[PDB]
Structure 1
Amino acid sequence: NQKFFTLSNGNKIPAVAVVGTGTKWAHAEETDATFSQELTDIVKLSLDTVPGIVHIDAAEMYKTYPELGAALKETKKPREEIFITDKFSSLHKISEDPKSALETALNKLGVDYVDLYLIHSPFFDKDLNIDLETAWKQLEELYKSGKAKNIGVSNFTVEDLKKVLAIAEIKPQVNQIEFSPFLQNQTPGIVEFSQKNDILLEAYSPLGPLAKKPTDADQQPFYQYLKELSEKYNKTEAQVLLLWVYKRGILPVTTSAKIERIKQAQDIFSFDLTEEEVKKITDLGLQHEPVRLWHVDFYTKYNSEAQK
């Protein structure tokens, strides 16, 4: 049975996002230009077949609205069984401001609102004629007008959150960060700070440790224990890790090309980790050095604090 997080505003969000539109298969030189049928297909198949409320992770920056649009139009999934996260591209300017970006997203997506709208990065493009304060106020209006049912940020440091909390009429509900066993603090003290201020974390690329397991794999305690738990529960290693993210009070955001893994992702609440299994994953993960796949140029300097 599906599990949800309760945001600070009372709204429910599916506790795993199993469908992402960040990753494309397009057979061309300029992949930025080419529609990916194989992406609309995997998304539409997800929507059609994945049980319960299906949480999609989109962003302006992915430039895959048409693909997601095509699948949304063609799906027999009704709109209220889809949870659509979308992200204003603040790092690489595509639209002037959040309101223009969301307007353009709704047009292309064929929907009237998104269920969550995030400011994608605190490092505002120098070409944007808006700063974070103004950016947030726009999201506050989109929220009020119901075009964004929930609002938050992504890749924000404690500092970035304070700037926003300092001017916030509507408290940001979500901070989407890179989080996994091998990067347990994207930026110094973010997890503890976010959870103490009732800001829900999502974890992007939580499956990093399983991206390409090391050569000396089942010598490494992290990988031995993870394997151990996969057999105990008769689940995939991925499912264990996704569930661990959840058990940490964080909403894991994952994607696959393979409908099996997506369905497995949705089905992580077919099982449960004990307190000590979670602590041990946490612990054995923390012995690993930081593995950061995202906002690398900005946050590499924070690596010394990521695996505390």
Structure 2
Amino acid sequence: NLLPKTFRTKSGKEISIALGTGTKWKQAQTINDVSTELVDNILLGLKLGFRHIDTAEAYNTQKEVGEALKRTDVPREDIWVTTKYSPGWGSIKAYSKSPSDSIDKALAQLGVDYVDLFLIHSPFFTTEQTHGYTLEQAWEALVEAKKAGKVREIGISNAAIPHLEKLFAASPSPEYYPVVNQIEFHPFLQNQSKNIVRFCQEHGILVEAFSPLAPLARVETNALAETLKRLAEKYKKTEAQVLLRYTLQRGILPVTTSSKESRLKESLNLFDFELTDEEVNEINKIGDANPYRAFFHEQFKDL
């Protein structure tokens, strides 16, 4: 009952909150080394109950996800795998020669016959970074991969409204529209660019939130701390569980990470309580009065 648009694994299970394999876990690209540390983390999340893994070309953790998928007792068909074509950032250019090579590279490193969700990592690139590809051309690659069956569902990350419109226009039909936009979202940044959440939800695009624990993990002072403590006390939950439940009640799918078994287990235990509309609104209000953006500050400056 939480998500306005949602999906199922190939075996027909609910897409759960996503275990991230980016941020603190990411690696230099030229590494072929598996980080046993990360593999064990992914296996642990799967045992605890995660059924959604988020990775990306740029994190160079597709190989660790692939190793976990081989070693885990959970059927692959019961898992949702999200990955991303990474076009480059500042000095760094795209690791792959083309978006289409990126997808084939994801299948190979993950050791899967299909990806559930394949996103363009960001719309903030030039064709110099991508070795010759525009946003529309990258979108064509994803559309071809969906038509082939390499990828089940297609979307983008960090897209503002004008980027979504360009995708709609580059789609051959409605069946090929983006259906996910993964953005930074938490109470101090409830709209990564103007009106993004509402726009996505009104056009059938599932919003995913990365850095949903930013108030706990990223900021030096958390203006929500008293509110989250009060609600924590009330529900007998942690302040992290409160934030992740809040995100889900806003209709948004959280992508979160932790290296600690207890926090992973807790991240999953969100379905035995429910914030009130007023508690959700309390968090909305305090959050909007204390803006904080963790990522892509120059890119969003005028968006």
- Scaled by the length of structure 1, the TM-score of the pair is 0.87
Moved more, 250-259 or 291-300: 291-300
CA contact (8 A) 2:16 2:51 kept: no
User: Taking structure 1 as reference, are residues 234 and 253 closer, same or farther at Cα in structure 2, changes over 3 Å only?
Assistant: same
Aligned to 2:57: 60
> Any unmatched runs of 5+ in structure 1?
303-308
Match status 1:157 vs 2:160: yes
CA contact (8 A) 2:160 2:193 kept: yes
Query: Structure 2 residue aligned with 1:242, among 220, 244, 269?
Result: 244
CA contact (8 A) 1:226 1:237 kept: yes
User: Taking structure 1 as reference, are residues 97 and 208 closer, same or farther at Cα in structure 2, changes over 3 Å only?
Assistant: same
Aligned to 2:22: 22
Match status 1:185 vs 2:191: yes
For residue 254 of structure 2, what is the amino acid of its counterpart?
A: P
User: Taking structure 1 as reference, are residues 233 and 9 closer, same or farther at Cα in structure 2, changes over 3 Å only?
Assistant: closer
CA contact (8 A) 1:5 1:13 kept: no
User: Taking structure 1 as reference, are residues 21 and 68 closer, same or farther at Cα in structure 2, changes over 3 Å only?
Assistant: same
* Deviation, structure 1 residue 184: 1.1
Aligned to 2:35: 36
Aligned to 1:82: 79
Q: Superposition pairs for residues 81-160 of structure 1, below 5 Å?
A: 81-91=78-88, 92-125=93-126, 126-128=128-130, 129-160=132-163
SS class of match (2:133): coil
For residue 262 of structure 2, what is the amino acid of its counterpart?
A: E
For residue 105 of structure 1, what is the amino acid of its counterpart?
A: A
CA contact (8 A) 1:44 1:71 kept: yes
Match status 1:199 vs 2:189: no
How many correspondences in the alignment? 291
Query: Structure 2 residue aligned with 1:208, among 207, 214, 226?
Result: 214
CA contact (8 A) 2:2 2:249 kept: no
Q: Superposition pairs for residues 215-294 of structure 1, below 5 Å?
A: 220=223, 222-289=224-291, 291-294=292-295
Moved over 6 A (4+): 8-12
* Deviation, structure 1 residue 3: 6.6
> Any unmatched runs of 5+ in structure 2?
none
CA contact (8 A) 2:96 2:102 kept: yes
Instruction: For 2:261 and 2:301, locate their aligned partners in 1 and report how far apart those are by CA, in whole Å.
Output: 33
For residue 236 of structure 2, what is the amino acid of its counterpart?
A: N
SS class of match (1:245): helix
Quick one: percent identity of the two aligned structures? 46
Moved more, 120-129 or 109-118: 120-129
User: Taking structure 1 as reference, are residues 25 and 116 closer, same or farther at Cα in structure 2, changes over 3 Å only?
Assistant: closer
* Deviation, structure 1 residue 264: 1.3
Moved more, 173-182 or 268-277: 268-277
User: Taking structure 1 as reference, are residues 110 and 255 closer, same or farther at Cα in structure 2, changes over 3 Å only?
Assistant: same
SS class of match (1:115): strand
For residue 119 of structure 2, what is the amino acid of its counterpart?
A: L
Instruction: For 1:106 and 1:93, locate their aligned partners in 2 and report how far apart those are by CA, in whole Å.
Output: 17
Instruction: For 1:5 and 1:83, locate their aligned partners in 2 and report how far apart those are by CA, in whole Å.
Output: 18
* Deviation, structure 1 residue 300: 4.1
Moved more, 61-70 or 234-243: 61-70
CA contact (8 A) 1:20 1:254 kept: yes
Instruction: For 1:9 and 1:66, locate their aligned partners in 2 and report how far apart those are by CA, in whole Å.
Output: 24
CA contact (8 A) 1:7 1:173 kept: no
Instruction: For 2:179 and 2:219, locate their aligned partners in 1 and report how far apart those are by CA, in whole Å.
Output: 34
* Deviation, structure 1 residue 24: 4.8
* Deviation, structure 1 residue 286: 0.8
Aligned to 1:69: 66
